[PDB]
Amino acid sequence: NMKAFLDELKAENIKKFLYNFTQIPHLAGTEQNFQLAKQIQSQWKEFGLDSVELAHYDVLLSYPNKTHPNYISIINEDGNEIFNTSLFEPPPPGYENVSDIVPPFSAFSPQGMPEGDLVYVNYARTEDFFKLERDMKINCSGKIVIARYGKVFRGNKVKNAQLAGAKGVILYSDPADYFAPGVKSYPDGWNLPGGGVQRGNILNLNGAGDPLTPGYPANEYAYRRGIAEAVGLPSIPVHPIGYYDAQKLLEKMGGSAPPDSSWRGSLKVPYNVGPGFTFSTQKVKMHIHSTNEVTRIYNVIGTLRGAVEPDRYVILGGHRDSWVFGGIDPQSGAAVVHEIVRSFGTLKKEGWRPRRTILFASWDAEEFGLLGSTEWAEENSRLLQERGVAYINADSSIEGNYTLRVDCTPLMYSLVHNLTKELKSPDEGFEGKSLYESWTKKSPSPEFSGMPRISKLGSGNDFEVFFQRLGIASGRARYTKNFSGYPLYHSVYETYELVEKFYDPMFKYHLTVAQVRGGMVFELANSIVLPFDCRDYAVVLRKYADKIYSISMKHPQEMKTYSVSFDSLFSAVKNFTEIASKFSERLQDFDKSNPIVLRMMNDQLMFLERAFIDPLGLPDRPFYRHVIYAPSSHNKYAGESFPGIYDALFDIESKVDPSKAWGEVKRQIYVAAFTVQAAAETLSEVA
Amino acid sequence: NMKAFLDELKAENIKKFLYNFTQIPHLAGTEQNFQLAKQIQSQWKEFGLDSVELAHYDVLLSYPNKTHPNYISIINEDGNEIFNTSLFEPPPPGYENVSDIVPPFSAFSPQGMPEGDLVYVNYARTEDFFKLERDMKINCSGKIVIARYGKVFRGNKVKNAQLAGAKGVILYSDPADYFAPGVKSYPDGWNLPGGGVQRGNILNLNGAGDPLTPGYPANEYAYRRGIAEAVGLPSIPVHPIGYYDAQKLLEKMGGSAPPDSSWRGSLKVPYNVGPGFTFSTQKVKMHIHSTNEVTRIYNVIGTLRGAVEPDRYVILGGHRDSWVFGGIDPQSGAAVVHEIVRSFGTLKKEGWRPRRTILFASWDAEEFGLLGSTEWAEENSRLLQERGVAYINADSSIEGNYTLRVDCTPLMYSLVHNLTKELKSPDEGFEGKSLYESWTKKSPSPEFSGMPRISKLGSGNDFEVFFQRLGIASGRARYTKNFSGYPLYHSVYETYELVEKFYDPMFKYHLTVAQVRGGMVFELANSIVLPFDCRDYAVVLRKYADKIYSISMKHPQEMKTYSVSFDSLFSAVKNFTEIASKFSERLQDFDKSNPIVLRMMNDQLMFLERAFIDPLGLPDRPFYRHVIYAPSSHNKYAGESFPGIYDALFDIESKVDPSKAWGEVKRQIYVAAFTVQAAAETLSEVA
Numbered sequence A, B: 001n002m003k004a005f006l007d008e009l010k011a012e013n014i015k016k017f018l019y020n021f022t023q024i025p026h027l028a029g030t031e032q033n034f035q036l037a038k039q040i041q042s043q044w045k046e047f048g049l050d051s052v053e054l055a056h057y058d059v060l061l062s063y064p065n066k067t068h069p070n071y072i073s074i075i076n077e078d079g080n081e082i083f084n085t086s087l088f089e090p091p092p093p094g095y096e097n098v099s100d101i102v103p104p105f106s107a108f109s110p111q112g113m114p115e116g117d118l119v120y121v122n123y124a125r126t127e128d129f130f131k132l133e134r135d136m137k138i139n140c141s142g143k144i145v146i147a148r149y150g151k152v153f154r155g156n157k158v159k160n161a162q163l164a165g166a167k168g169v170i171l172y173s174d175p176a177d178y179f180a181p182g183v184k185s186y187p188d189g190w191n192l193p194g195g196g197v198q199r200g201n202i203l204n205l206n207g208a209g210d211p212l213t214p215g216y217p218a219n220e221y222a223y224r225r226g227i228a229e230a231v232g233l234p235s236i237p238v239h240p241i242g243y244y245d246a247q248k249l250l251e252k253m254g255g256s257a258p259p260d261s262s263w264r265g266s267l268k269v270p271y272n273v274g275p276g277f278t279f280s281t282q283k284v285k286m287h288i289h290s291t292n293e294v295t296r297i298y299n300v301i302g303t304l305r306g307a308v309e310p311d312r313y314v315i316l317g318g319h320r321d322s323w324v325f326g327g328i329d330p331q332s333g334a335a336v337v338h339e340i341v342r343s344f345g346t347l348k349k350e351g352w353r354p355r356r357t358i359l360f361a362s363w364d365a366e367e368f369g370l371l372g373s374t375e376w377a378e379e380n381s382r383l384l385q386e387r388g389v390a391y392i393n394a395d396s397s398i399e400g401n402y403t404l405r406v407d408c409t410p411l412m413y414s415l416v417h418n419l420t421k422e423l424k425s426p427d428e429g430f431e432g433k434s435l436y437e438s439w440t441k442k443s444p445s446p447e448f449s450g451m452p453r454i455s456k457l458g459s460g461n462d463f464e465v466f467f468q469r470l471g472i473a474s475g476r477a478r479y480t481k482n483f484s485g486y487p488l489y490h491s492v493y494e495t496y497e498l499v500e501k502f503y504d505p506m507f508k509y510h511l512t513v514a515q516v517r518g519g520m521v522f523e524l525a526n527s528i529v530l531p532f533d534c535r536d537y538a539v540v541l542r543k544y545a546d547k548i549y550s551i552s553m554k555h556p557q558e559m560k561t562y563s564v565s566f567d568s569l570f571s572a573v574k575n576f577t578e579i580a581s582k583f584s585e586r587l588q589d590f591d592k593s594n595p596i597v598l599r600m601m602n603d604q605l606m607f608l609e610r611a612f613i614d615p616l617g618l619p620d621r622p623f624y625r626h627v628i629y630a631p632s633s634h635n636k637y638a639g640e641s642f643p644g645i646y647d648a649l650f651d652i653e654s655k656v657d658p659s660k661a662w663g664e665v666k667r668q669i670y671v672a673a674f675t676v677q678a679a680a681e682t683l684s685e686v687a
């Protein structure tokens, strides 16, 4: 029973694991990581799992040339290099030791050394570029863009700048976004020092996994494409800096005023758009010499076999590779997984077994484009779609200590509300009250009324293949701060210390997340009828149908000129509601003793998410096939609904051929409509 | 029990039905057909099915302009029209009546009226064009091609000629292929008169269904493409003639000798390739004025619910629409379906029910590109792939009276051998012996030894969506003559009389096919463990791996220059064999009393075919996704194995960039390999 499962999870053990997991750096593709993989394997065996496998792949990674450093210079009249950027972050107290920490870099930047005139662009979000080029009419072509971390996935900014003719991109972290007021820098607080630099990859893989083998696993015989047709390589070099060097590049900034205060961080400078320097005169030069190279990577997979339905897969997965020590990202998740596995292996040993099979993966190479988990899905896709019940993700557990944060598919809302109601909040001041209670109090849904917010699912972490390509019901949970991240995210300062001292001394937030996570696994893996409520879907679907409808009405002139009708979507959506009522009625009324009828319904429940998948995929993104959600085309971290239609509606006034554009909005609508209906009828009586 | 099912099927009833089904013409989209649909619906209800539905679609059909006739003229110096082609076939005795029989035409021809010089091209198969243009070096560009029915799907010839710059195509049926020696023309024998003309469609839909809605159902709201982007429309006009008119166009034929006797039918003429006439002087002119138009069509669907596993679908389907009366194609199949349904509805009434749900479809619009069945699959694709156990096809039952003819997926070979062994042959001279016996004797497998031939599955009839796009195990059976067809195929002479008098007076061949067909349904629908032998697949897979390997060796120079290795395929194939052994072992050993374990294995069996599907599809043909079989790119009627690799190997010497070509052969190999392995591991233990 569940009560048992939970009681067995101990905070102390988590501390133990997190400490063990973050003494040395753990970069994808390095021996340190191969060795940790070898370790997780044994202790998982030891904790009593039936089988623990390594699965390895040979994929494209990316590194800095050790003997020939990346950096930014400023250059005078005859390229005297006046100023240079750091070559590494000042290491935290007690890691001179730190034998080799990769220097900052943007993974997969093309090689290059371009020169030209900074133009500042803010976040390099779509609208900034709109603001720049439609109003200011400042022109990015030929220039070097410097932009600031925060807001949207860094791969989006580099794609944007590229679109806008740029020839280089420099990212920096502005205290504006990474400096909580009144807290002190590491080692003494948790604010990011002006020395540190957010590492991270900049690919736009859009779901393909290893860029050389879209569609198939990158195993021994896998045919690989030319780096020249690689999926999602930028063609302009990119590099990141802390706010000290930043300041030094920002401070001489020419051309216009920031078109407004929304464009200005807390660096003491003009934040001038540009281009040029005021030093007229002086110019910027990047030095990028990283190389890309096929490298081998290692996933850890441990089966805990089902006793009743060994052919139903519940999957708990998180990544193992870090940019540096990774005290928060990923090892605070990893630690939690570990205590979870051990706790299961414990009941198992007491002679207990789950109704369904549970799978535990330590993923590899997350930081380089969700490569580790993806190739595995590509290899096992058939077994996953005919058997995958649900996937729970397990990256960082805390990124803040203020409240819970959950994203998931509507089919888990009910289970998540029930489960959080059966758990103690560990918030200062809700000792005594439930986790549903604190969470609801602190974080209340827009969608109303007495309801904790739960978010959509975009991409940006390892659940993406499983929900967006395959249609397996997915979800995640972690503790958050009151997209930009936390200040010391993906930097040398993410250390075990960072957690013990400042985030969760008690380890009570870890162990809450360890309960939401293992608790969801547990329910999903063991409960006689699947925890899904097909009705919640019927709810959000009608909200979403409204949202998209409102958007279109921004243009009723056209809507009339072209007979743009949402009746089909609403019609489809109504039918869904109706069928799910009837369905759940039936779900109430049927002797749980009849196993065949049971299995038949859980199949209806299980394959329901699968019903929102189009084999053709969304336009231009073949590996994004959920019709209801995909990653935002403007920010991959953010999920969007009816992406097919939103994307067609987006920025539509700017299109030359309005009849063709509006035609495609219609096509998109008619695909949504049919897919909602088609899904619905999976819930209808089977004969 | 099965014995009962069979005994209940009566030849007399079949005659009854076939007679009823062929008194008037039954063209897709006409009221006669809507009415027959209305009929099948009631009698199916009456015969005792639980539900019988109409499902309707609005798809692109194609007709001749009634007030403005299609035809071929010859034209002198100042376009005097000297000779014209028939405008209809002389109707058989007793159908002046015949109120309106569509005139011959090729469906979906573009409109046009071009002039130029016949060039004769034989069958318009790929090699003929090779022969013409690589040897003869006779150049088809600018010309009008006349070619002869037979050998390959008529859509292939029109595509070929188009490729070869042609500006028109005339098909004819040459007594060479449609005149069995020593038999007399209809009404007196079954040879095709020189008046009659094979009707038929010429689209290259390559799996898409209704050309306006590839991917989605053509329901009420479905967005439709411009006829200008329609899927698989030819852009040169086509038209068919009997051998009388043929002769008149063939007789003046200029340029070269037929490059050999393989190129010559039994018309008394030179069979001169051309181009030009000898009449120098005179020229050919086509007159095509057909129109394409969205029209509504009607499928009939009848459920017979399962008692144990109502969520497993066994499907028996055949088409209902005819080009004229359709005494053979389709109504000899349809009649058989009818007697089959009635027979089931009979046991049902006696209070019996199948273990699984059986589905019975009368399909619409087969003759126009497999449209009827396809749109239905597109609409229900989700329900079909998570539930479709198998599909048996039911077009024409006899096309000859000499032996059985079966095509199917390897997973049905065993069931088909067992079942035919339990049935009486109805061959003159095997009274006393089994149907396995006569069939084996008359038609012995190349693949050896004491084994009836069974063929691959291409396309060319309604099973195509179900096997080639969806991966549902498919099969078919009918009586055959000792691709070209039978002489009176798709002509006015296909009548009830044609069958009673010449093919099967007794109705004993019908009723054998009615037994193979209903018998397979019965087993598949009712047997406790699915009739599939995953081992037979392990057999043919290794044969196929050999075939393709032999092909490549035609080029060992290259094979060496590029390290072209099949090890991966063989490796994959070996693994398959091994896993299926082990699998079937397990299948022997497991208490059939445990329902959950039962269901789990039948799922492994059921989804196994599904495992050979690639969501990305084969190159250029997105709706052909079986990696093991697709339709031949040179003849859609013919199935080919490892189509992905064969097609890359095909005609490879002619390619400019041999490194790119050979690279793609490799890619193709590595996809086969992985897919065979991936399938295999579905058969592995589930945890």
Ligand SMILES: *[C@@H]1O[C@H](CO)[C@@H](O[C@@H]2O[C@H](CO)[C@@H](O[C@@H]3O[C@H](CO)[C@@H](O)[C@H](O[C@H]4O[C@H](CO)[C@@H](O)[C@H](O)[C@@H]4O)[C@@H]3O)[C@H](O)[C@H]2NC(C)=O)[C@H](O)[C@H]1NC(C)=O
Residues within 6 Å of the ligand: A568, A569, A571, A572, A575, A673, A674, A677, B220
């Ligand atoms: C939501 O669920 C409901 C089922 O409860 C479903 O209802 C269906 O609506 C369809 C779509 O319009 C109805 O369509 C009609 O079918 C009849 C035959 O029964 C036809 O005669 C109609 O066609 C005539 O009129 C057309 C429309 O104006 C003309 O274009 C045409 O030329 C004809 O003259 C029409 O096709 C259908 O009957 C029902 N089925 C029912 C009511 O049970 C609805 O479609 C579902 N929504 C979605 C988005 O899938």
Ligand SMILES: *[C@@H]1O[C@H](CO)[C@@H](O[C@@H]2O[C@H](CO)[C@@H](O[C@@H]3O[C@H](CO)[C@@H](O)[C@H](O[C@H]4O[C@H](CO)[C@@H](O)[C@H](O)[C@@H]4O)[C@@H]3O)[C@H](O)[C@H]2NC(C)=O)[C@H](O)[C@H]1NC(C)=O
Residues within 6 Å of the ligand: A220, B568, B569, B571, B572, B575, B673, B674, B677
């Ligand atoms: C058919 O089924 C069998 C399983 O019975 C399956 O066997 C596998 O073969 C793979 C493919 O080659 C083996 O691959 C090796 O794995 C080890 C680790 O265990 C590696 O060290 C090897 O890599 C080294 O050598 C490579 C190859 O020459 C070098 O490129 C590389 O740099 C390394 O130094 C290699 O990757 C694997 O061990 C087995 N699994 C087994 C034997 O259980 C076979 O692949 C299946 N066939 C197909 C087509 O899928």
Ligand SMILES: *[C@@H]1O[C@H](CO)[C@@H](O[C@@H]2O[C@H](CO)[C@@H](O)[C@H](O)[C@H]2NC(C)=O)[C@H](O)[C@H]1NC(C)=O
Residues within 6 Å of the ligand: A019, A020, A023, A024, A038, A039, A042, A043
């Ligand atoms: C982290 O924890 C693990 C597990 O206890 C330690 O691994 C063991 O330590 C020693 C090596 O000094 C060996 O005797 C055991 O083989 C190790 N077990 C393994 C490899 O699973 C690991 O060394 C600890 N590492 C750190 C960095 O604290």
Ligand SMILES: *[C@@H]1O[C@H](CO)[C@@H](O[C@@H]2O[C@H](CO)[C@@H](O)[C@H](O)[C@H]2NC(C)=O)[C@H](O)[C@H]1NC(C)=O
Residues within 6 Å of the ligand: A073, A079, A080, A081, A082, A083, A084
């Ligand atoms: C920034 O670093 C650069 C690169 O090393 C320095 O310029 C180099 O100085 C070496 C040693 O004198 C020269 O011989 C190389 O020509 C230089 N490289 C280039 C491309 O200029 C430079 O000293 C630095 N500028 C500052 C502010 O220290």
Ligand SMILES: *[C@@H]1O[C@H](CO)[C@@H](O[C@@H]2O[C@H](CO)[C@@H](O)[C@H](O)[C@H]2NC(C)=O)[C@H](O)[C@H]1NC(C)=O
Residues within 6 Å of the ligand: A414, A415, A418, A530, A531, A532, A533
């Ligand atoms: C969450 O809890 C609610 C109430 O516990 C569950 O819905 C109830 O389940 C019982 C047991 O079947 C039903 O008979 C009641 O009708 C339900 N109450 C309501 C308001 O529906 C729901 O099952 C739970 N969600 C889960 C566990 O997935």
Ligand SMILES: *[C@@H]1O[C@H](CO)[C@@H](O[C@@H]2O[C@H](CO)[C@@H](O)[C@H](O)[C@H]2NC(C)=O)[C@H](O)[C@H]1NC(C)=O
Residues within 6 Å of the ligand: B019, B020, B023, B024, B038, B039, B042, B043
């Ligand atoms: C073929 O068979 C059917 C079924 O017996 C005949 O349909 C019945 O005939 C008369 C109409 O004259 C009606 O009283 C019944 O309603 C019909 N039943 C139906 C429509 O299912 C049908 O007329 C026969 N047609 C031919 C061409 O022989």
Ligand SMILES: *[C@@H]1O[C@H](CO)[C@@H](O[C@@H]2O[C@H](CO)[C@@H](O)[C@H](O)[C@H]2NC(C)=O)[C@H](O)[C@H]1NC(C)=O
Residues within 6 Å of the ligand: B073, B079, B080, B081, B082, B083, B084
């Ligand atoms: C072939 O049929 C054509 C088409 O009708 C005949 O030519 C037509 O004759 C009518 C009646 O005299 C003319 O006024 C039209 O100009 C003709 N149409 C064309 C395009 O020529 C012609 O008589 C026929 N040839 C033969 C052998 O009977």
Ligand SMILES: *[C@@H]1O[C@H](CO)[C@@H](O[C@@H]2O[C@H](CO)[C@@H](O)[C@H](O)[C@H]2NC(C)=O)[C@H](O)[C@H]1NC(C)=O
Residues within 6 Å of the ligand: B414, B415, B418, B530, B531, B532, B533
């Ligand atoms: C076709 O018949 C053969 C023999 O009837 C079947 O294989 C036998 O099935 C029995 C019953 O399980 C097994 O114990 C024997 O080992 C089998 N004999 C052989 C040679 O395998 C096979 O099941 C049948 N194929 C079907 C019905 O799908």
Ligand SMILES: *[C@@H]1O[C@H](CO)[C@@H](O)[C@H](O)[C@H]1NC(C)=O
Residues within 6 Å of the ligand: A065, A066, A067, A068, A291
């Ligand atoms: C690293 O630097 C050297 C020369 O400074 C370069 O030639 C070498 O190939 C580099 N290694 C790579 C590209 O991995």
Ligand SMILES: *[C@@H]1O[C@H](CO)[C@@H](O)[C@H](O)[C@H]1NC(C)=O
Residues within 6 Å of the ligand: A139, A140, A141, A142
């Ligand atoms: C931007 O500037 C460059 C001039 O170097 C030019 O080539 C490009 O067409 C310009 N376009 C815009 C967006 O004004």
Ligand SMILES: *[C@@H]1O[C@H](CO)[C@@H](O)[C@H](O)[C@H]1NC(C)=O
Residues within 6 Å of the ligand: A190, A400, A401, A481, A502, A503, A504
């Ligand atoms: C954890 O403790 C307190 C409670 O609000 C908070 O102020 C502190 O900043 C928290 N940890 C972090 C690093 O946010």
Ligand SMILES: *[C@@H]1O[C@H](CO)[C@@H](O)[C@H](O)[C@H]1NC(C)=O
Residues within 6 Å of the ligand: B065, B066, B067, B068, B291
């Ligand atoms: C049939 O023939 C006439 C004129 O001869 C043509 O204008 C009419 O539109 C045609 N009907 C069609 C194209 O369906």
Ligand SMILES: *[C@@H]1O[C@H](CO)[C@@H](O)[C@H](O)[C@H]1NC(C)=O
Residues within 6 Å of the ligand: B139, B140, B141, B142
């Ligand atoms: C075939 O003939 C025509 C001349 O009308 C020409 O335009 C085309 O290039 C020729 N090509 C071949 C295949 O010889």
Ligand SMILES: *[C@@H]1O[C@H](CO)[C@@H](O)[C@H](O)[C@H]1NC(C)=O
Residues within 6 Å of the ligand: B190, B400, B401, B481, B502, B503, B504
């Ligand atoms: C049916 O009967 C005999 C047996 O061989 C055959 O010669 C005749 O041609 C058959 N039917 C047809 C039309 O082939």
Ligand SMILES: N[C@@H](Cn1oc(=O)[nH]c1=O)C(=O)O
Residues within 6 Å of the ligand: A200, A201, A202, A203, A366, A367, A368, A369, A370, A459, A460, A461, A636
């Ligand atoms: N979570 C990582 C990895 N990352 O997430 C993606 O979706 N792509 C990608 O590289 C990051 O945000 O840096």
Ligand SMILES: N[C@@H](Cn1oc(=O)[nH]c1=O)C(=O)O
Residues within 6 Å of the ligand: B200, B201, B202, B203, B366, B367, B368, B369, B370, B459, B460, B461, B636
């Ligand atoms: N069976 C018919 C229909 N036909 O089969 C296809 O595969 N396409 C198509 O139009 C024929 O052969 O004429």
